[PDB]
Symmetry: C3
């Protein structure tokens, strides 16, 4: 990886965004590497959680002006052939992919949180903010549509709060972001961040990977199909988990007050 | 009823979940009794609210291990004839049915709130927690899918807050449950809990029964169909209500600065 | 306009509801004039924002009895032809229209906010409450279904908080209204109300009109079609904006550390 530092750490992969020189501005190249890492871990057993963090006290400054310059310089198509379409769309593919990943996705969100980075925060299972975290959508002030980001902001916090943020192009701080639900928690120091992150990784260790993945997929279906058919499907998944190896293991563990296999070390 | 105490009390049915010995663990039998009570009152016009409360300071400890034992020992099945399927699915049927009941459903949640109990709280029109209420999804921790509960958590508080509770299997206190919208209010004493309950029941007395039920049914349709057609249907319901008994009665009551008949 | 005082200031149309005599009870005539104004400005490119305010310290005290009496007098009919149908439906028509307007809609809500007024507040891009603001749904208390208003309350604040307000016929104050998301901010006094308005109008000045409009329409689509197809269309809108007058102008503005033309004082 050119753009990211990877580190295994028990059942959890730490992904550090590694371009502190340009405040982690997000380039097409990064997008592709993120897409790749998430595709590779998707059907991997040892990885239960993925932590997203930026090197240098900044999560993401925005896009990379260079990819835009690059795309202007290419031949103009008009459709999905247009280099600006292709450039922009890949941000949404990757964000959506991360949203639907079978892994527990944790975003540690420091300093600037913009563009693609704001999107990633909007699709995490847990987001923790550092006290300098700033979240903004200045796009319309530049005559640009926040096309790939705003839709995840609507899912994240709802239409009512998203309207205000997106259409007035506001920049907000960690405390307001937490109140709105962009992030779940705010840490008042670099220390508290660590504790909060560790507590959450503790939680990941105790939770069963297959059950966690099946649950997560059920959650994304709520509200997009009738509840009754969803619950039918949910009950089949329950019956299947009970008769499969994880549920078997989990029963034994509660019998003897001991930790289950997936939770050891 | 064997798992529930039913007490009528004006236009309000008080349903007390009554297995204090096992801190109100929810059994298939309880599921069936709840489902039956709610079908029976669905049209009984003298009942306007149902209050759900657990005896002995706990709402629901979880599922009944004995129902699972029972299912294990039955003959295994393919898919929807699997006994685990039937057992689990019945919980979601009851919860969905409570959610769509034409009555105003108030939940009073104290102590442990888990499994079916958590689901019921997530499906109430008003939920009031006592200071000791704890809400947890420990399921994935035991290699179990919280299949019939988590979906109602998502409906109740949104995907963003539900993914965190469910996927980290957290257990939260009343204040956090209120802040997220699992419950609407938190009492700080048993007394404050009674008063809030009584204020809510007073509001139920003042509200017209057929209009409350029609309104409720429309609230559930929002976001599951095109808004323009919903408003069309809603305007027909408006017209019908105005023609009918309650509208007539309601306008007069306001004209004569007096309580309407359903408030009696 | 018979019920409304209209005032233009910059690209902001200030619409003042003007029946202080009856605390701004919303008549069928008011509904018709509101719908007319929003139809006309929909293309007028000199208007960027519409501000809704009430005269005399109240936003809307409810429906107009006169319209109801009028409707009882008319020939009864069935379904679409029922005069009660017609009377009711038009309120939702207008509210939906205002919800989807291309303009940034700001609601300034004081005193009573009920009926159509509550509905409007629930479809604003930004709502600011003054300290006297009171929001209620007394309809079922009168044997009436709040048919046109409640569906927007559900979109505004969610089913969970809306079931309580609506089905117990509650009336709440400004700070509870803010906590639930009916309004986005609350003022302590008159002059704070003015600052908040001016700050919002400043943000409107800085945001480019066409991009604001395209973004707003993408936002209303979220949750009502598959995400992937929506991001497809979003990227198309992004490309077209980049290659349009507004996008070219905006990059310029940022090249020469100068305001873009749409910001022009």
């Amino acid at each position: 990886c050119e753009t990211l530092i990877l580190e295994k750490q028990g059942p959890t992969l730490v992904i550090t965004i590694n371009r502190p020189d340009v405040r982690n501005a997000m380039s097409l190249q990064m997008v592709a590497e993120l897409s790749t890492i998430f595709s590779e871990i998707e059907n991997d057993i040892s990885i239960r959680a993925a932590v997203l963090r930026g090197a240098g006290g900044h999560f993401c400054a925005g896009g990379d002006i260079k990819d835009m310059a690059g795309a202007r310089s290419q031949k103009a198509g008009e459709g999905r052939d247009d280099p600006f379409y292709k450039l922009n769309r890949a941000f949404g593919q990757m964000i959506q992919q991360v949203n639907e990943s079978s892994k527990v996705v944790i975003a540690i969100t420091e300093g600037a949180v913009m563009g693609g980075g704001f999107g990633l925060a909007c699709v995490s299972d847990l987001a923790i903010a550092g006290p300098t975290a700033k979240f903004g959508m200045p796009e319309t002030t530049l005559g640009v549509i926040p096309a790939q980001i705003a839709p995840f902001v609507v899912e994240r916090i709802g239409l009512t709060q998203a309207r205000r943020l997106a259409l007035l192009g506001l920049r907000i701080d960690a405390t307001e972001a937490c109140k709105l639900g962009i992030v779940h928690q705010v840490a008042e120091s670099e220390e508290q961040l660590s504790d909060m992150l560790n507590q959450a990784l503790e939680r990941v260790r105790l939770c069963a990977p297959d059950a966690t993945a099946e649950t997560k997929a059920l959650l994304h279906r709520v509200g997009h199909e009738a509840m009754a058919g969803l619950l039918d499907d949910a009950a089949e998944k329950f019956a299947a988990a009970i008769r499969g190896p994880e549920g078997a293991e989990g029963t034994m563990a509660f019998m003897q007050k001991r930790e289950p296999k997936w939770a050891e070390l």
